[PDB]
Each structure stands twice: as C-alpha cells, then as structure tokens.
C-alpha cells in the first residue's frame, strides 16, 4: 500500500465528517483496583501525549508497493489455494440484496450500530434510516444505490480504543477505513455466498477461522494442524500489501468460477479513495483496515501469501502438506517437519512485508502449542479432559481492558464480558481476579458469573 497523492475537500468536492474528536474511553471504577499502562489512542493533531506528528504518523504504515504484477510463485500458490477451495463448491452466483442486507444464517445482517459511511454519515444519514430487520425491505437501499452509486470514496477516521504507551507517544494509532453502505451491499451481493461457506466452514479446507468461536473451535486445531506449528506477527499487514496480491486473489476468484462483474470489485478495494476529515487522498494496493466485511479476503490473500513464500524460499516443497487458518494478519500453520522462520520473513521482505517471529527471541523454537498464540489467545488443555482445549486471553490483556469504560452504566455487563474469557485461564486464576473484582464495593455488588458453571456450559458445548 502506497498513498499517490493528498487533495484538500474543497478541490475534490468530497464531503467533510467532522470530526468529533475527544475520546469516548473514561477511566473505570477498576481503574486503580487493577494494574495496567494503556490509555486511550491519539485522536487529534494537538494530543498533549504526541511526540511526533499524528498525521504523518498515522499514514506511515503505507511502505510502499513492492511487486505489481504475480510472478511465478505467486501464480503457483494462488492456483494450489484455488484447487483446494474447490472442493467447498462454492455457489458464485450472486445473492440477493434482501440477504446481503439482512442476513442468512450463515451471513450475519449489516450492523446497524455503525456509520453507513460516505456520503450519509457526512448527510447525517444512518443505516436504521434505510434498514429495518422487522420489514426486511430493500427497496429504500436500492433507492440509495441508485442515488449515489457505486466506487464511492472510504470515510475515514481513528479508532477510538486503547494503545500502549509507547503507541500514544508514537502516534501510532488506528484508522477505521469505512466502506459505503452502498459498496458494503453490492460486495455482499456478489460474493454472499462465498462468506457463508467461509462462515460455516472454519478451518483447514477454507484456511479461514473469520467467525469460529475459540470456545469449541480451539479443540479442533491440533486435529487439524498435526506435526510441527509455526507461526509469527506481521508488522501493519494490511498497508503493507501490494496489488499483487489483490491480483493473484481476482486469480484465485476466476479459478473458483466467479463471472468478471464480481471480480473486478477487487479493484474498488486496491485502488482506493479515502476522506479524512477535510482531505481526500488515493490509496494504491493495501486492504482497508476499519470494517470486518474485508476480514475474508485478508485471509484469503494470507493463504495466498504463506504458500509463496514457502515454494520460494524452499525448492520442491510440498503444498500438499501445509495445513493452516488465517484470521486476517493472523495465522497459525504447521507442517509435517520445522520450517526456518527467518527464511521465510527474509523471503517475505522482497514481497514488502515485515514479519517477525512469535516470541522474543529472534525466532521460533519451535513454537508448538505451549507458547503458541492465536486470535491473542494461548492453548491450555482442559486439566480433567486434555482433549479439551481453552482459549486463553492474557490476564494482562484483561486487566488492561478492565481499567476504561465507554458507558459508566455498562459496569456489570462489561465485567460479565471479561469473566466469559477470564476463567479459561484456570480455576486459580478466576479466583484472584474475581477477587480483585471483589476487593471494592462496587465489585461485591455485581452479578459475577460462578467457575464450575462456566465450566459446565463449557462442557455442554461438546
Ligand atoms: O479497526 C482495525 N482492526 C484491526 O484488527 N486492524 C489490524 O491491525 C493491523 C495493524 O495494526 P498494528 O500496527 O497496531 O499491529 P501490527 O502488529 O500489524 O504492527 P506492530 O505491533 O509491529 O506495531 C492491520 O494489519 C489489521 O489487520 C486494523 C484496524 Br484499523
Ligand atoms: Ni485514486
């Protein structure tokens, strides 16, 4: 991903959000019951906690376009991925808008809780103005589509969520690149089908865990991925993706039987036009980071990326042999035997990415279910039932989520919420953290869930 160039509003035409820039995160009644250093990101230019300038900084993880066009690893890779997508039988015929809209239920509706993006969130147009789940009508939606049409510009703007210190004092915060309502629903319409197969199927056929749900289908992973794991972080995956990728993918797409009207939406997502606030900008190559309806092609664009890197780092490999699920940036893959991780982030360098090994370290060792990390979360076997696994958040990372509230009104559900991910960390664990709930009036006044019950519907899953 690459910026091509910045034009004020005024030059473009293009209409301005605003923003409303004060952060919406308050300090919560844990906030100095539990310990953590993580406060709310960098909003506005003039943030008191800058060391640098925010806007620059926001936009640097755009580090430029490497490769435009597949070579022949890529192609190789794209085709093995595509092959192996076959056998889903994907329909590619297009679904309908009252579905896409609305949801099947495999698809989940379009969530009325967030902006319909440009130009209504700019007109003060939301998306309960043009949506009702009780009427299921589309007619107002094709009243829209017709008024504004498609390829429209991604209203732009940060993320409103917590960052470590070192992030805030760098700047780096998040954006939340949002597609038009119109663009969300006519990509929803040609590729319905494809996210509800995806949805259904998660794991190693798909490559794909978007939507699993880490309670039942963290059991299933060392089933399907046998032998040695390996696995690292991408450094700003999405603006690092050139449009080769987004080229080998419309490959992946033509293999699969979609008609050339579908694919080429691929285009309105590599080439694309943001507003942040009052200026309108191009972006070349890299995914648009803020909605989740984008999820899907990440990982597919990952399955793509891990096969090349690996049939060219390692002559003759067997493709046949990988096993892997992407979520997004996030994968988890193994293999019958190790792989050097530093070979395959050296191989991935010439592609533009940065990747560095899960640990510390500089690299696996081997990496294997222990210290493995996926979706944030660890791999623990249930202590009475070892095939049993529990996806494990980090303490830490629930700790600092404890800390802050959007809505001070929201203090039993929110902690309710922490609980339903806390206690797989061990009976050990819930204790002193129920108990640090507990250490303050406030806590020993809330509803907090009991272990063995959580436990119990846990098992119930099975
Ligand atoms: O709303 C959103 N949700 C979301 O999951 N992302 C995802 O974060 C990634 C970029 O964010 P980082 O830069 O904070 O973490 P990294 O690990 O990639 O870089 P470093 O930890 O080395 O600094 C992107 O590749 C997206 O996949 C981005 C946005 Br925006
Ligand atoms: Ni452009």
């Not at 435009?68 to 192996?84: F, G, R, S, T, W």
């Not at 039988?89 to 579905?99: G, K, R």
Request: aromatic share 12%.
């Amino acid at each position: 991903g690459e910026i091509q160039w910045v034009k004020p509003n005024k030059e473009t035409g293009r209409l301005s959000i605003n923003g409303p820039t004060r952060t919406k995160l308050e300090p919560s009644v844990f906030h100095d019951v539990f310990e953590g250093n993580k406060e709310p990101a960098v909003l506005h230019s003039k943030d008191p906690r800058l060391e640098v300038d925010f806007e620059q900084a926001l936009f640097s993880k755009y580090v430029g376009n490497t490769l435009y066009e597949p070579d022949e690893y890529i192609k190789e890779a794209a085709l093995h991925y595509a092959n192996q997508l076959k056998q889903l039988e994907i329909n590619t015929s297009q679904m309908s808008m009252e579905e896409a809209c609305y949801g099947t239920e495999n698809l989940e509706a379009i969530d009325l809780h967030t902006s319909a993006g440009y130009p209504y969130s700019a007109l003060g147009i939301k998306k309960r103005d043009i949506l009702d789940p009780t009427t299921r009508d589309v007619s107002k939606m094709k009243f829209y589509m017709d008024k504004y049409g498609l390829d429209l510009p991604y209203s732009t703007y940060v993320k409103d969520e917590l960052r470590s210190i070192d992030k805030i004092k760098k700047g780096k915060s998040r954006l939340i690149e949002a597609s038009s309502l119109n663009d969300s629903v006519y990509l929803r319409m040609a590729f319905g089908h494809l996210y509800e197969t995806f949805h259904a199927n998660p794991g190693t056929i798909t490559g794909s865990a978007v939507g699993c749900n880490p309670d039942t289908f963290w059991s299933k992973l060392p089933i399907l991925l046998p032998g040695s794991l390996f696995a690292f972080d991408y450094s700003g995956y999405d603006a690092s993706l050139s449009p080769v990728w987004f080229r080998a993918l419309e490959l992946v797409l033509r293999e699969i039987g979609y008609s050339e009207g579908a694919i080429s939406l691929i285009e309105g997502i590599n080439h694309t036009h943001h507003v942040y606030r009052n200026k309108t900008y191009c972006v070349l190559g890299g995914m648009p980071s803020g909605c989740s309806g984008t999820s899907i092609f990440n990982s597919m664009i990952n399955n793509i990326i891990i096969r090349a890197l690996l049939i060219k780092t390692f002559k003759g490999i067997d493709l046949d042999e990988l096993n892997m699920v992407a979520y997004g940036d996030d994968v988890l893959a193994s293999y019958p035997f190790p792989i050097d991780c530093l070979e395959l982030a050296k191989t991935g360098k010439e592609y533009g990415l940065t990747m560095t090994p899960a640990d510390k370290s500089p690299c696996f060792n081997e990496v294997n279910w222990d210290n493995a990390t996926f979706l944030k979360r660890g791999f623990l076997p249930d202590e009475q039932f070892p095939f049993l696994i529990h996806p494990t958040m980090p303490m830490r990372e629930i700790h600092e989520s404890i800390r802050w509230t959007k809505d001070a009104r929201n203090t039993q559900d929110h902690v309710r919420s922490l609980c339903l991910l806390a206690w797989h960390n061990g009976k050990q664990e819930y204790e002193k953290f129920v108990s640090t709930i507990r250490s303050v009036p406030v806590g020993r006044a809330l509803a907090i869930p009991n272990y063995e019950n959580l436990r119990r519907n846990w098992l119930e899953l099975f």
